[model samples]
Target chain A: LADSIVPRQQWAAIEPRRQIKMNGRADEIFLWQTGPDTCSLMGGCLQDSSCTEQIVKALQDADFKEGNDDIKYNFLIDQDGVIYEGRGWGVVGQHTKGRDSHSIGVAVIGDFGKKEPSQALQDALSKLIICGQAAEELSSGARLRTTPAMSGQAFYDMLDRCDGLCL
Target chain B: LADSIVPRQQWAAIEPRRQIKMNGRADEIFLWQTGPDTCSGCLQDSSCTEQIVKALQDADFKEGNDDIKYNFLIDQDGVIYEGRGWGVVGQHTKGRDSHSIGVAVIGDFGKKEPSQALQDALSKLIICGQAAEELSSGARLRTTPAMSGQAFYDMLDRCDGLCL
Candidate 1:
C-alpha cells in the first residue's frame, strides 16, 4: 500500500502563532488554574467560556466571594506580547474557572482554521498536555488515569482487552 | 483518582493470552505473493510443489519442500494437509482443478480427509509475512483499484473533481 500523505506547507504557516513563549523560548507552555479545587472538572468553570461570567456564577453559587469581590477562578495567559483567555477542557476558547482549579488548563495556538492540525503543532500541544497531566498527577493525590474517550497507549491497551469478546 | 486496577484472577488468565494473540495477529497480517502469478497459487500434483520450490529459490535463495514448497503458494493450511501428502487443494481431492494446476507430482487423498484439510489441520500452519515488494504496487488493478486513504470529506471532494 502507498504511504499515507499529509499536507506540510499549509501547516507551517500556522505554527508560529500557536506557540507560547517562556524564558525567550517559544516552546514553553502553561496550565493556569481558574477556580475552586473541590468541584469536578465536568461541573465547574467548565460550564462556559465567559470566564468572567462563569466566575460570577461560581462566586454566586458557592457564596464564597461576596459583594465588592474580586473574581477568583478565571485563568489567563501572557503570551508573546499578547494576552488571551483560556478555553475550557473540551471547548474552543480560553480556560474556564472550573477547569483552572480542579483541572490544569493549557493553551497552544495555531491557525486551527485548516482542515488538519500540523505535526509540529500536534507535537507541541501533546507535550503541553503531557506536562499538565504529569503535574496534576504529581501534586494532587489523583492518578493520571485514562478512559476510553482519552487517546493514548494506556487507553489503547485497556480497549484492546475488551475487543472481540466484550462491548 | 484510584490506581488503575484489574482483578488479579482475570489478569492472570487473560493478559498473557491477549498479548500472545496480538503478537501473532500482527506478525502475519500483511501477506503478499512472492512468486509470479503464472503458477503461484495453482494446485497441481506433487511436482507442482517442486516447480514452486524452484521458482521461489530463483526469486530468493530459499528452500521449499512439502512443508515449505517452492513453486506454488500454499498458505499455512494448505502446507499442513497437502504437504502431509493428503493433497487437499489438488483437483482430485475436491474433484476441482481450476486453481490446482501446479502440483501434479503430489498424490491426492479422497473425500476422507476433508475435515483435516479445512479447519483444524491447515489453518495452524500459515505464517503471516509481509507481501513481496513487487506485488505491492499495481496489484490493485481495475478489478481491485487502489483505495485513496483520505478523510471522508476530502476524498468526496477529490472524487467530485474527477468530472466522470
Candidate 2:
C-alpha cells in the first residue's frame, strides 16, 4: 500500500523555484530502466541515499545544461525500494521526447539490463501506481510503457496484476 | 484512503512565488473549532465551500490578518479546502504557528460530532500531510474536541506516525 512507500520528505532535498516546471495533471505513467552509462548496478550503492542524490544531481545538471528546467522524471525508485520525488505528482515532466504533457515518468534507479529490479522496488512501484489510480489522477486503464530493459508485455502484466490486487 | 483528499494541483492555483513564505518543517498539528460564528450544516450544503471561505475571511479580518490563519479547513461532506498551502506559514496559533499546521473544521465540533465523511477527510488529510513531508512523522496532534475528542484522537493514531 502507499503507507509502505517512503514520503518525499525522507528522500528529496528542496529544488529551486526556477527549476520546477509547473504544468497540467498526469494521465499516464512511464517506466524507464536507467542505462548503464547513467548509473551503475553493483555492490551496496543501490541502497545508498547518497547514491540517489548523485543521480539526482547528475540529472539536474544534464537537464540544466541542455537549457531545461529540471530533471525529467516525476519520481525515481531506487533498487532498495526508496522512492524519491523529482518533479512530484501533477507536474508535467520532461522525460519523454514529446509526451511530457499528461504523463508522469518513473525511472528505476539502476541499469535493469544487467540486473533485474528487486522485489522491493517492484512492490514500491505497484503501490505508487495503485495510489495514482485511487487518486483519480490516473485512469483505470492507464497505459504503461517501458524502456529497452524489459518487454512491454512484462510491464503490462505486472500492472495488470497490480490492478487486480488493488481492485 | 488518502487518495480521496484533494490534490495539490486543485488546491494551489498558480499562487505567486512572492506570496509563499517558506520556513521550518512542521512538527505538530493543531486542530480548532469555528465556534458558533462559522458556517453550519456544511455536511449537506452545496454552498459550503463559499460559506466556509467567507467565514474564514471574516475571522481573518477580525484578527487583523490579511490572509486566512488555518492551513486547511474541512467541510462535513469530507471535502478539504485549502486555506494556505504547505509553503506558506499560517497565523493560526500564537507561538506555535511556526512549527505547526493549523486545521479547523468548519462547524463547532464540540457541540456536535462531525459526520463520518468529515472524520474520514481529516484522516486522509493527515496521511497526505505526512506523505508530502509537510508534517513530520513524529508530529503531535492536538484538538479541543468536547465530545468528539476521543474519536479524533483515535483517527489520528491511524495516520501511521502522527501521534495524539
Candidate 3:
C-alpha cells in the first residue's frame, strides 16, 4: 500500500562517489524529523522539487562531515504524501549514528515543532512501513522510532492499527 | 551530455505491471526517431509531450501491449524524458530490449534538419550512460533500416564516446 516513490534520478540525484553495500536486510528502520548534506558522487543530484531538494542538500553537508557522501536517508516523505527515494532501497544510510547500516533511515521533510506531521504523511508512512515489511527490506518486527521530542507513542500505535484494518 | 531526463513518475507514469530485469548491464544502445509517429514540430511544441506519453501508456494499458517502448525520449527543446530509466530492460527496438537502451528523437528527421539541441541531448545521454557504466564501453549503436533519415544517423556517427 506504499505510495509510488519518485526515483532519485527523477529528482536529479547526483551519483554517489562510492556506494556502501548492505550486509543483509535491515533489521530496523529509523524515522527522523526534517531535523536533518552534500551531493553524492556515483549518481549525482540535480535541481528538483523544492522541499525534497532542500533535504538532499542538508544531508550532503551533514553526511560529509562524517565522511559519507550523498543524502544519508534511504527515503523521505513530504507533507503532500509524496515519498522521494533517497540512497534508495538497500544501501547503508548515514542517519542513526551507530545504527546506520542496520537501519533504513526515513525522514519527514518538515519541522515537527510548530506543527504536527500531517495526516497524509502519517498514512503514507504507515503504508510505507507495511510495504517495507512485505518487501522484506525491513524486518517485520522492526521498531518505529520518531524524534522523541516531538510526540509520544501515538505514531507507533497507529501503524500497528493499520495491519488489522484490511479484513 | 544527456540532458536531464524527467523521470517517469514526474510525468505521471504508472508503475510497470511487471519489470523485466536486464542482465548485468546493457550490451548495446539504440537510436530511433518519431517518424512513424512524426513530430517535427515537437522541439518548440510542449503541448503534446504529455499526449505522446499517454498514447504510449494507453497502448500498453488498453491495447494489450506490455509497456511504454522506449527507455528514453528526446524532444527538440532538448528535453529527455525517462521512459523506463537506466539499467532496466527496455521495450524498444525488437530483438534487443533486454540488452539495450533505446533513445528516440521526437522530431521527424527525414525532412527537417535535426535540431542542435535535440541531437546534443541524445549525444550527451549516450555519453552519460556510458560514463555511468550502464552501457558497454564499446556498445555499438543499433537501428533498423525501416527507420529513414540518413542525416540523423550522420550526426550520430560523430556523437562523442559513442559508436555506430
Q: Which candidate is the best by DockQ?
A: 2
DockQ of predictions, in order shown: 0.02, 0.13, 0.02
Give the distance in Å from residue A129's predicted Cα in candidate 1 to where it truly belongs: 2.5
Whose lDDT is higher: candidate 1's or candidate 2's? 2
Candidates sorted by DockQ, descending order?
A: 2, 1, 3
Error of 3 at B113 (Å): 3.0
Listed per prediction, chain B TM-scores read 0.25, 0.73, 0.81
lDDT of 2 by residue, A117-156 (tens): 6777786776666456545566656666654543233444
Better of 1 and 2 by TM-score: 2
How large is the i-RMS for each model, in angstroms?
A: 14.5, 4.9, 16.9
Give the per-residue lDDT of model 3 (tens digit) for A67-155: 77788789887766667788877799787888887778887766555455567777666656655653457676777765444222444
Task: Name the weakest run of 10 consecutive residues (lDDT summed) in model 2 chain A.
Answer: A1-10
Docking class of 1: incorrect
Please tell me which model should have the higher DockQ, number 2 or number 3. Answer: 2
Q: Rate the local accuracy (lDDT) of all candidates.
A: 0.25, 0.63, 0.64
**Model 1 ranges off by over 4 Å:** A1-94, A136-167, B1-164
Report the Cα lDDT for residue B65, model 2.
71
Per-residue lDDT value at B88 in model 1: 21
